[PDB]
């Protein structure tokens, strides 16, 4: 149209790799362990 642009992906320079995310496994499973500690006291004698 008159005076409007539209921005799009033109090209990719280089190799093509995977977009991702990284968490530490030790810290995350320690966090899940502590959440399980706090969560067993609301559902006693059960495995979550």
């Amino acid at each position, epitope marked *: 149209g008159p005076g409007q642009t539209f921005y799009a992906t033109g090209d990719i320079i280089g*190799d093509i790799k995977q977009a991702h995310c990284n968490i530490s496994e030790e810290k995350w499973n320690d966090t899940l362990q502590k959440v399980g500690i706090e969560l067993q006291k609301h559902f006693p004698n059960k495995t979550i």
Partner: antibody
Amino acid sequence: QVQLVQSGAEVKKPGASVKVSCKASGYRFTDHYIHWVRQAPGQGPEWMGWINTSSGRSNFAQKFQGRVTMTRDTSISTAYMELNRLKSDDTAVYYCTTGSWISLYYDSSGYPNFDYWGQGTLVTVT
Amino acid sequence: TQPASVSGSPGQPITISCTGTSSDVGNYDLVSWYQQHPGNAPKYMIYEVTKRPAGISNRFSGSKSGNTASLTISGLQAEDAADYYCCSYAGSSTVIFGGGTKVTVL
């Protein structure tokens, strides 16, 4: 010990095409990039391009576009170097080099870690 | 850019420099150094800005100052008369070289 085997001499008239074959041994073809180095006699080396051996995506230099194609075969673990419309300045030594480690999470294609070099080939244009 | 040749007596260090633009060496520390004997493939002893692979002693040492990268050869011997090339990453997944330097060991 890993090793790279390159093709023999290629003597032909200008205007034709040259295929250079590079065969790897001692390591799997999927894990590493393959780069190409062209060295004119009495002149320094010149980078030519890289190929992702895991998928076949390749890139060339800024002034070799339209003349150069990269192919490979992972079954027999080799790469092919096709150059079209050669000129008299294309008489040079061609080297197949092993680059960085191919990883799916970060672009290590442009790393100039040329670990192992092949024996090279000579291309003479009459 | 690279000096054409350097000369030196045995038993003393020498330096070979490579000065490039900010996009070549200033932005990215990917610089490498190879030597090439005549009638032979180029060798492999510097890959990162300072690192060395296995099988290479402390004869060679790389460094980067600002916009240039210099390789220092601590001591000299008659084996070190090969032609030295520096190489770097120029951006946009494009790799460039230096051009060459001939070492004349006395």
